[PDB]
Each structure stands twice: as C-alpha cells, then as structure tokens.
C-alpha cells in the first residue's frame, strides 16, 4: 500500500546552532510529497537510508533489526525499545520473523506519531508528536544517537498495527532555521520549478519576476562508432593452411605488415590445436597494433614441439628455434599428423627465433670428436627427420605451430550502424564528440574528412563507409528560467527553456525558447 509523505522527514543535518537564517544543504532526505510505503512484518531493503514512522499507542512496535543477512552468517544491528530503556547490540544473531555471538558493541539509554530516521558510522534522529493518514503539518527530527559501529546495512526488519517506510534520496534542501535554533520550514529544491526558484534565491518569499534556476541539456541517447571498411587481411590465412608447413630444423618467417590482423578469427578458432600467446590475450589481440607481426613457423613431434615458448628451455626447441624471453607475442597450432605427415609420419621434415639457436643441418651438438664434417657420429646434427609415428594422434604424432611478436599490423576496428537526427555520442576514426548528426548539402573535396567552423572546431564529418557529409549540431542545451507572479499572490509558475525547440523537452514556442505552463494570448498589454 502507498500514501503521500507530504513534508515529514526533515532532520537537523549537522550539530550546529544557526540564528533566524535560511541554510542550504546537501544530504539524504525524504523527498517532499513522495510515496511512503504503508504497512499494517516483512524484511525490507534499507537502500541509502530509511525514514520510519507509526501511531502505535500502546508502544506496539518494540524494535528493529538491520544488516545484510539478518542471520548468524555475519553481524547484524539489533535495536529494542525495552520498557525500562533503549537497548542496542551488534551480535551475529540467528532468529525467525521475531525472537520471543561476536557482540562487538552494545549501548543503553493514535494520540501520537512516533517518528524516526536511520542513516549511515550509523546515526538516528527522532520526533514524537500528537496526531488525529500522516499529518500535513511540519516538524524536523532532532538527533538521537551516533554509533561508531560501521556495520554493513543493506536490509532491515521490524519487531513488535499501522506503520510507514520511505527512502532518503540524496537531495538539496533549503532549511528555515529560527530564533531558538529550531528548523521551522523546508523547501526540497528538486520538487518543482518554484522550489528550484526558492533555493536559488535562498528565500521562502519570491517576488514577481523571471529567475534563472538550472541548465537544461539533452543527454546523448547512444554512442555511434565508424571506421573505413576492413580490407587487406593478414597472411595468417595462407600460413595456417600451408601443407608445406616449415620443418623446425629449417624454420621460416615473414613480416605481416600493412594488414588487417584478424586475430579474433583465431580467438574463436574451434579447429585450432592450441594457442600460445605470451603477449596480449587473443580477445585484446583481435584489437591490437604493432609495426609488424614477426610471424614464423615450425613443426616436430607434438610432445617435443610443445617446447616452443619465449624464454623456454626444452631440448627440441634448442635443436630448432627456441625464442628469447623478449619474444612474447601471439601463437597458434594445427594437427600435422592428419595432413603434414609423410609415410614415415614426422620423418617428412627435419625435427625440433627462426634458426636463432645457431641451428643448421651441418655438424652441431656433440663433443665426442673435434667436429670433423660428418653430420652423424662425429658431432651429431640433432634436428634429423622427426620421430613421431604416422598412426598416432598429433601429440604422439607430428604437430605444427607458428607465432609472431609485435604501426601497420592492425586488428579490425568494429563499427556500429549509423544514426541520424538524435543527440548521440560519435566516434569517427580518431575524431570523438557528442552531437546531433544530420545528413547535409555541404560538399567537400575527396581527400578531406572534416568540416570546421570559423572558431576552428569540428562542424561536419564524411562518413567513412557511405561518403555523405554529416553536418553536426551540438546536443541542444540552454538556460532554464522560471516566470512567476510573487509567491505572495500565487504558487503557480511557468518555465522557459531558453533557445530550445519544444520538440526537445500547456506549451508555447516563443522566439526566445519553449515556454511551459503559460497560456498564449493575442491581446497586448
């Protein structure tokens, strides 16, 4: 059930006395004339902070519970209006709807409305007033306690008839402090254009006139992104489809540059035997950039070819092309046993940077003789025809892999559909802004991309995918001004949105902006 809150729920924001002065403040307050939720109990959200009230004549409401769990999984604030005194605790309680321990803090202290605010470190305010369904009458709540406890409060309950709840919005208030230091009246500046006017003037009386109060600005309704069409894909499409894929004893490479590096196609690659990216993760690498990809390939028996990493130490990679620790980059692999293998399997090619381990087919490894030029028994060449069996799967059989470390090897720039005639954010290439993009007559030369104004600011764009010129207007904004008779005469007001078109917000389009609430007249005075 719901009911209008009227003006109830103002409280002394801070601990200071003020004379008969109008004080402006920012705090968590019950917005004027908002809905209280009325109850006649369930656990509820605390949200930002809670106004609460009831008319329980026989002190029927006995207390409250607050926390995240309201159960022994963590601590919870308990409050009870016991018959002798107020009692407060913070134990890790465990109870049902109402009871009828790590207790790190404790404290003790229908004719009527009993009325409170709970806030958060935690604080309470109250008032207790006679009543005749909330009164239309105004009275602020005095502070009642502040507790050092700092409990995580997100929900609350009630312990025990009619009672009310409402949520403290962040709000700007003007408060009428008075001769005894008391608050006698209040405004809620956000309520209506007259309440903005009262707050702007710092006054409860407002004279006949037109007053500025705020800036109206149309917000951008979405973000549009545009780039030229993708073209000139990376040579990866040939590399990972090469039946002639390089032997690790004779590894080979090329600079992928001036290309669309479509690494997203590898990121999603359900057929890939592996991916080995020691640099950027492939989801980011699909949008990476570098001067070129250092793209290079090798193949061996799968379990030995698994040694191929930057800063790795495996003997097979030492015997082929083992990368330095500075070789962080992208990598990918394929099942060579299914196609790259010969009749002898991995014997199709010389087994495990390109030739960077001083690797060649001559004498290499073994200190058994002075390395006289026989590639066998004198001083073994390690990278002979690979040992992986043709009948095995590509871990026991042969496997092939390639990799590339990082101004011209560029990932694809995705673009949105275009939008027209709406205030939106726009990105076109490196140009960013916020505006109403509109189709236009303004022709300009084939190499050119932008408009300009005389003030050297962006004024138009060529769309990079259908070469029309879009004239750009900023998102409409202007002053808000409140026309008013004196409050002494009426509370009725009319709003002028300066220089706006009434489409953009009775209503009247004046020559100075859109006027609201005022009636047009053909007489003159």
């Amino acid at each position: 059930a719901y009911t209008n809150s009227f003006t109830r729920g103002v409280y002394y924001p801070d601990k200071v006395f003020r004379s008969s002065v109008l004080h402006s403040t920012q705090d968590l307050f019950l917005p004027f004339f908002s809905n209280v939720t009325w109850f006649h109990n369930p656990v509820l959200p605390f949200n930002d902070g809670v106004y609460f009230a009831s008319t329980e004549k026989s002190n029927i409401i006995r207390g409250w519970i607050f926390g995240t769990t309201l159960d022994s999984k963590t601590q919870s604030l308990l409050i009870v209006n016991n018959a002798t005194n107020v009692v407060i605790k913070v134990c890790e309680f465990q109870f049902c709807n109402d009871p009828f321990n790590n207790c790190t803090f404790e404290y003790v202290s229908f004719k009527n409305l009993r009325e409170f605010v709970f806030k958060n470190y935690f604080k309470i305010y109250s008032k207790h007033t006679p009543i005749n369904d909330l009164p239309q009458g105004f009275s602020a709540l005095e502070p009642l306690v502040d507790l050092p406890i700092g409990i995580n409060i997100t929900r609350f309950q009630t312990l025990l008839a009619a009672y009310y709840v409402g949520y403290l919005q962040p709000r700007t208030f003007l408060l009428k402090y008075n001769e005894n230091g008391t608050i006698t009246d209040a405004v809620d500046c956000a309520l209506d254009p007259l309440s903005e006017t009262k707050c702007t003037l710092k006054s409860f009386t407002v004279e006949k006139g037109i007053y500025q109060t705020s800036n109206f600005r149309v917000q951008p309704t979405e973000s549009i992104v545009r780039f030229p069409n993708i073209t000139n894909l990376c040579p990866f499409g040939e590399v990972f489809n090469a039946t002639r894929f390089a032997s690790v004893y004779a590894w080979n490479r090329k600079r992928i540059s001036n290309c669309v590096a479509d690494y997203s196609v590898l990121y999603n690659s359900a057929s890939f035997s592996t991916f080995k990216c020691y640099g950027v993760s492939p989801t980011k690498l699909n949008d990476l950039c570098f001067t070129n990809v250092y793209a290079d390939s090798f193949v061996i028996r799968g379990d030995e070819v698994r040694q191929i990493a930057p800063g790795q130490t495996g003997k097979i990679a030492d015997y082929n092309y083992k990368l330095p620790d500075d070789f962080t980059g992208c990598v990918i692999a394929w099942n060579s046993n299914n196609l790259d293998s010969k009749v002898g399997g991995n014997y199709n090619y010389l087994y495990r940077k390109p030739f960077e381990r001083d690797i060649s087919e001559a004498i290499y490894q073994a200190g058994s003789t002075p390395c006289n030029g026989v590639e066998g028994y004198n001083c073994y060449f390690p990278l002979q025809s690979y040992g992986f069996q043709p009948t095995n799967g590509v871990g026991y059989q042969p496997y092939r892999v390639v990799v590339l470390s990082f101004a011209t090897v560029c990932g694809p720039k995705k673009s949105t559909n275009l939008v027209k005639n709406k205030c939106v954010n726009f990105n076109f290439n490196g140009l960013t802004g916020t505006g109403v993009l509109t189709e236009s007559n303004k022709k300009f030369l084939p190499f050119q991309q932008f408009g300009r104004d005389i003030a050297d600011t962006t004024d138009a764009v060529r769309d990079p995918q259908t070469l029309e010129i879009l004239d750009i207007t900023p998102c409409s904004f202007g002053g808000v001004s409140v026309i008013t008779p004196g409050t002494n005469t009426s509370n009725e007001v009319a709003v002028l949105y300066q220089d706006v078109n009434c489409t953009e917000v009775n209503v009247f389009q004046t020559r100075a902006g859109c006027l609201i609430g005022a009636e047009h007249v053909n007489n003159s005075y």
């Epitope: 359900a270 890939f272 035997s273 592996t274 080995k276 020691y278 990598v331 095995n392």
Partner: antibody, heavy 131, light 114 residues
Framework: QVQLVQSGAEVKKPGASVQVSCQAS????????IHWVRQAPGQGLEWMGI????????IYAQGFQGRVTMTRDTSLNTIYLELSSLRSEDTAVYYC????????????????????????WGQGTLVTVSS | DIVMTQSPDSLAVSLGERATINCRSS????????????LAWYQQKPGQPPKLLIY???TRESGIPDRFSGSGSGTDFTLTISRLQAEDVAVYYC?????????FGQGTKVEIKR
C-alpha cells in the same frame, strides 16, 4: 574441488550409439584441457579424449577417436557426451576428469600442455552393453 | 609415445608392514626443460574416473592417502602401503601431465595378503 559429476547412465551397444553427460566449473571448464575419463568396470578409467570445454577445442585417444564423442558446454557448467560405432567395452562407465590449469602466462587454448591427469573426477556415470 | 601403464595390478601386503603399487611411462617423464617430472598418482574407488592424490610426483593432496601415497623415480613411480592394507587400500595408477594421449593406468589395487 571442481564441480565434477556424471549423468545419463544407460545401455549402449557395440557398433551402435551411446549417450552421456558430465558437470564442470572453474579452471577445469575454461583454464585447462579436461579429460573425458571412461573404462570397462574391471578397471580404473582412462582418457577417451582431451577437451578445452569453452569452445570445446578437442583431441581424442586413438582407440576412441571414432567410438566416442565429447562437446563444449563449460559456461553451461557442463560437458556434453555421446558415442557412435561403440567399442566392445560398450558397458564402460564414464565422467569428466577436472584437468589442472595452465601453468604459465600463455593465452588461448591450452591443449599444448598437460594430459588426462586431473585434480577431480565426476565419480563415473554407469553403462551396460546394449547388445 | 608416453605409454603411462601400471605394473602389479594387485598387492598382497602384510599387516603393519609396507609394499608399493608401481607404474611407469616408457621414456623421458622428467622432461628436459626443468626435469619437472610430468606425472602424478591417481587414487580412488575401483572403476572410477581418475583423480590425482599423490600430486606432481613428489607431493600430496589435502587429506591425501599419505601412507598409501607416493612419488616418481625416473621413467617409473610408486604409491606406498605402510600399514595401508585396508581402508587406505585404494585403486591406484600413475598418470601423465606429459601429453594429450597420456592418461591413468587401470587402477591397480593396494590390499592385504590373504
């Protein structure tokens, strides 16, 4: 440790079809090459194949390359299971084996590492020889 | 290929004595980059999918079989049986972190002599 489980237990026939299911979570779903682990009830189970369960990137043991199939489902907290032309051991129970995660800062499908050795197992969903 | 396979299929240990369940690969498991021993022992109930409990050929899981647990040795490995002939008498085999075709042996049994 892992959310390992097995499901869909039924009769399946040699040379004919079979069906199954398994449960997955955390690094065994998206950070390791999990094993499909199965055997005839006379022994502890072994790898029918190795699966990277996000996107499913797959390799099989050559006795079960045709006879058994597995599918990606890691975001569904799962792995899908099937068979066709089933082995003579068609009564073999099976479950997911929760592979140990990628041990270094490489990125993409980790099948370049590990084997059917795993930090958890789905206890084995039963089977019977439908022939 | 790796050939991860078990040796005894069953034990017959004396009560209060010890024995080992044994297993091996064919070659190179202390792999050349680090000698980082790419094997571990699965132990579980008979007929189950494999789970590791003697981890990384030199370590053990949280609440692992301990007196029934064990370690690698070159191409070979063992799980122990010190007073473990009953209750800790699991089905056990070594398995490889070594490769894609690598998998557990057929769950050879720790058990008491009869």
């Amino acid at each position: 440790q892992v959310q390992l489980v097995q499901s869909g237990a039924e009769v399946k026939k040699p040379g004919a079809s079979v069906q199954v299911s398994c449960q997955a979570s955390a690094n065994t779903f998206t950070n390791h090459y999990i094993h499909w682990v199965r055997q005839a009830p006379g022994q502890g189970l072994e790898w029918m194949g190795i699966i990277y369960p996000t996107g499913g990137n797959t390799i099989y043991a050559q006795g079960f390359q045709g006879r058994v199939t597995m599918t990606r489902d890691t975001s569904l907290n799962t792995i899908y299971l099937e068979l066709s032309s089933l082995r003579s051991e068609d009564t073999a129970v099976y479950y997911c084996a929760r592979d140990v995660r990628v041990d270094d800062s490489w990125s993409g499908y980790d099948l370049l590492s590990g084997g059917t050795y795993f930090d958890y197992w789905g206890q084995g969903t039963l089977v019977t020889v439908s022939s | 290929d790796i050939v991860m396979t078990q040796s005894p299929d069953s034990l017959a240990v004396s009560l209060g004595e010890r024995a080992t369940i044994n297993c091996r690969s064919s070659q190179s498991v202390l792999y050349s980059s680090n000698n980082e021993n790419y094997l571990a022992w699965y132990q579980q109930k008979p007929g189950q999918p494999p789970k590791l409990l003697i981890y990384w050929a030199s370590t053990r899981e949280s609440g692992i079989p301990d007196r029934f647990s064990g370690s690698g040795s070159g191409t070979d490995f063992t799980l122990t049986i010190s007073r473990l002939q009953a209750e800790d008498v699991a089905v056990y085999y070594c398995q490889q972190y070594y490769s894609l075709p690598r998998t557990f042996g057929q769950g050879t049994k720790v058990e008491i002599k009869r």
